[PDB]
Design an enzyme around this catalytic site. Structure first.
Site, short mmCIF file in Angstrom:
data_model
loop_
_atom_site.label_atom_id
_atom_site.label_comp_id
_atom_site.label_asym_id
_atom_site.label_seq_id
_atom_site.Cartn_x
_atom_site.Cartn_y
_atom_site.Cartn_z
N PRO A 1 -17.30 -23.45 9.17
CA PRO A 1 -17.46 -21.59 8.24
C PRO A 1 -19.32 -21.87 8.39
O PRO A 1 -20.43 -22.52 9.12
CB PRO A 1 -17.40 -22.00 7.06
N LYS A 32 -13.88 -27.98 4.83
CA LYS A 32 -14.55 -28.28 6.73
C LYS A 32 -15.75 -29.93 6.14
O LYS A 32 -16.41 -29.19 4.66
CB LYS A 32 -14.95 -27.13 6.64
N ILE A 64 -12.77 -20.51 11.05
CA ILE A 64 -11.32 -20.70 12.11
C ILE A 64 -10.29 -21.28 11.15
O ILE A 64 -10.28 -22.32 10.18
CB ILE A 64 -11.57 -21.42 13.21
#
Length: 117
Positions: A1, A32, A64
């Protein structure tokens, strides 16, 4: 990110190590790994938020797949506001966040794009 934070707080009023703590927080919130979180802090800017030049901060979050729905972003928002209001000593009304979904073909990594990694 990718996290980008703009603020009108001078550099010497931004807590030391904020960019690092933001990495751990983002990992926990977005799910993440911390070693995949990228943070950019730009202090000492001239800003008006809601028409007021009082101390404020703008955060942009790009990733994403995990910031593409209102339901997901509602949760992320809650946690990031909690983290920022505490770290920067700002009220909830002095922070705004923008979420931007990205796709793998948009990310250049080690001389290629993520589509091929």
């Amino acid at each position: 990110p990718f996290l980008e934070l703009d603020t009108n707080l001078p550099a010497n009023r931004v807590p030391a190590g904020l960019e690092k703590r933001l990495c751990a927080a983002a990992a926990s919130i977005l799910g993440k790994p911390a070693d995949r979180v990228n943070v950019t802090v730009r202090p000492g800017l001239a800003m008006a938020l809601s028409g007021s030049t009082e101390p404020c901060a703008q955060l942009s979050i790009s990733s994403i797949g995990v910031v593409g729905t209102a339901e997901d972003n509602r949760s992320h928002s809650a946690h990031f506001f909690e983290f920022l209001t505490k770290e920067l000593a700002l009220g909830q009304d002095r922070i705004l966040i923008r979420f931007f979904p990205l796709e793998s073909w948009q990310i250049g990594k080690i001389g290629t794009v993520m589509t091929f990694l």
